[PDB]
């Protein structure tokens, strides 16, 4: 019998969540979550969103999530290739620009924003809880 | 019903070492913060070991907010005491700031950016609850 999640992670529902130790571009953030046998945050419901905002309520830092698109002609997709479900959140910020390395989304102050993927931000990683 | 595999800590809490921690999601005065922890059969944060301090320092490094702990001083002529009635030891930190007789309900301690400060207990801050992990 093992714990649902490792020490320092937050156990919520079927998953475990962790804030990254550092601030890096999106690709490096993706790599760092993978190294923890995890992936960047994927929001499947408004319950997920509300839990995340509860958890980052005390931070003003922007946190990358696993949502990105190459440019505005591409829909937003999660790392696993699934789409952003409707009625979860409206992505604001830099949504009309095209960046050499794509556009990625981060959550900050309870909202989701588009930004150049080459910029640095902390991130939230998640993995399945051992239940 | 005896559990088949009891988790060290409940959902939404963070497990570190011997304890479980619950970070608030809003700012409230000390009494309300204390009540919240008590309602969960827990208590406000008590930093009693270097492990506790290191964990809290890292967890709050993502924040500029103040977090109430379970340490208070009734007034200047009384000592700092944890909720469990034990005294504040001098090993981990000193409480910086003012302890005023003009405060209506005593002086309370919060941790912010790693340092611990005194403040009027009726002001609002985030807080951290703590209880023993089921190991």
Swiss-Prot record, chain A:
Q: Which residues form the C-type lectin domain?
A: 12-126
Q: In which tissues is it expressed?
A: Expressed at high level in endothelial cells and vascular-rich organs such as placenta, lung, liver and brain, aortic intima, bone marrow, spinal cord and substantia nigra. Also expressed at the surface of dendritic cells. Widely expressed at intermediate and low level.
Positions of disulphide bridges: 5-16, 33-125, 104-117
Which compartments is it annotated to reside in?
Answer: Cell membrane; Membrane raft; Secreted
Q: What is the effect of changing residue 90 to N?
A: Does not affect subcellular location but displays a reduced affinity for acetylated LDL (AcLDL). Abolishes binding to acetylated LDL (AcLDL)
Outcome following mutation: residue 5 to S: Abolishes sorting into the cell surface and binding to acetylated LDL (AcLDL) while increasing N-glycosylation
Q: What residue ranges lie in the Extracellular compartment?
A: 1-131
What's the impact of mutating residue 16 to S? Abolishes sorting into the cell surface and binding to acetylated LDL (AcLDL) while increasing N-glycosylation
Q: Where is this site: Not glycosylated?
A: 44
Q: What is the effect of changing residue 1 to S?
A: Abolishes homodimerization
Source organism, top-level taxon: Eukaryota
The entry's stated outcome for residue 28 to N is: Myocardial infarction susceptibility
Domain notes, please?
Answer: The cytoplasmic region is required for subcellular sorting on the cell surface.
Give the record's disease field.
Independent association genetic studies have implicated OLR1 gene variants in myocardial infarction susceptibility. OLR1 may be involved in Alzheimer disease (AD). Involvement in AD is however unclear: according to some authors, variations in OLR1 modify the risk of AD. While according to others they do not.
Q: What is this protein called?
A: Oxidized low-density lipoprotein receptor 1
State the organism of origin.
Answer: Homo sapiens
Phylogenetic lineage: Eukaryota, Metazoa, Chordata, Craniata, Vertebrata
What fragment of the full-length protein is this?
A: 140 to 270 of 273
Swiss-Prot record, chain B:
Q: What is the effect of changing residue 113 to N?
A: Does not affect subcellular location but displays a reduced affinity for acetylated LDL (AcLDL)
A GO cellular component term found in this entry reads: nucleoplasm
Keywords per UniProt = Cell adhesion, Cell membrane, Coiled coil, Disulfide bond, Glycoprotein, Immunity, Inflammatory response, Lectin, Lipoprotein, Membrane, Palmitate, Receptor, Secreted, Signal-anchor, Transmembrane, Transmembrane helix
What is known about the tissue distribution of this protein?
Answer: Expressed at high level in endothelial cells and vascular-rich organs such as placenta, lung, liver and brain, aortic intima, bone marrow, spinal cord and substantia nigra. Also expressed at the surface of dendritic cells. Widely expressed at intermediate and low level.
Q: What is its main location?
A: membrane
Location comes to:
Cell membrane; Membrane raft; Secreted
* Record PTM: The intrachain disulfide-bonds prevent N-glycosylation at some sites. N-glycosylated.
**Induction summary:** By inflammatory cytokines such as TNF, IFNG/IFN-gamma, IL6/interleukin-6 and by pathological conditions such as hyperlipidemia, hypertension and diabetes mellitus. Up-regulated in atherosclerotic lesions, by oxLDL, reactive oxygen species and fluid shear stress, suggesting that it may participate in amplification of oxLDL-induced vascular dysfunction.
- The protein's recorded glycosylation sites are 4
Q: Which residues form the C-type lectin domain?
A: 16-130
Q: Which domain of life is it from?
A: Eukaryota
Q: How changing residue 121 to S affects the protein?
A: Abolishes sorting into the cell surface and binding to acetylated LDL (AcLDL) while increasing N-glycosylation
> Subunit notes for this chain?
Homodimer; disulfide-linked. May form a hexamer composed of 3 homodimers. Interacts with HSP70. (Microbial infection) Binds to the head and beginning of the coiled stalk of N.meningitidis adhesin A (nadA) variant 3; binding can be abrogated by monoclonal antibodies against the specific regions of NadA. Binding occurs in protein microarrays, in solution and when LOX-1 is expressed on the cell surface.
What's the stated role of this polypeptide? Receptor that mediates the recognition, internalization and degradation of oxidatively modified low density lipoprotein (oxLDL) by vascular endothelial cells. OxLDL is a marker of atherosclerosis that induces vascular endothelial cell activation and dysfunction, resulting in pro-inflammatory responses, pro-oxidative conditions and apoptosis.
Q: What is known of its domains?
A: The cytoplasmic region is required for subcellular sorting on the cell surface.
Protein name in UniProt:
Oxidized low-density lipoprotein receptor 1
The organism of origin for this protein:
Homo sapiens
Name of the gene this protein is made from: OLR1
Complete-protein stretch covered: 136 to 270 of 273
């Amino acid at each position: 019998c093992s714990a649902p999640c490792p020490q320092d992670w937050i156990w919520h529902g079927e998953n475990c969540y962790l804030f990254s130790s550092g601030s890096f571009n999106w690709e490096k953030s993706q790599e760092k979550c993978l190294s923890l046998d995890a992936k960047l945050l994927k929001i499947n419901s408004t319950a997920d969103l509300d839990f995340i905002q509860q958890a980052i309520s005390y931070s003003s830092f922007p946190f990358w999530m696993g949502l990105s698109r190459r440019n505005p002609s591409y829909p937003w997709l999660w790392e696993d290739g699934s789409p952003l479900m409707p009625h979860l959140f409206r992505v604001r910020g830099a949504v009309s620009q095209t960046y050499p390395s794509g556009t990625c989304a981060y959550i900050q102050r309870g909202a989701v924003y588009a930004e150049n993927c080459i910029l640095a931000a902390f991130s939230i990683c998640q993995k399945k809880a051992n239940l």
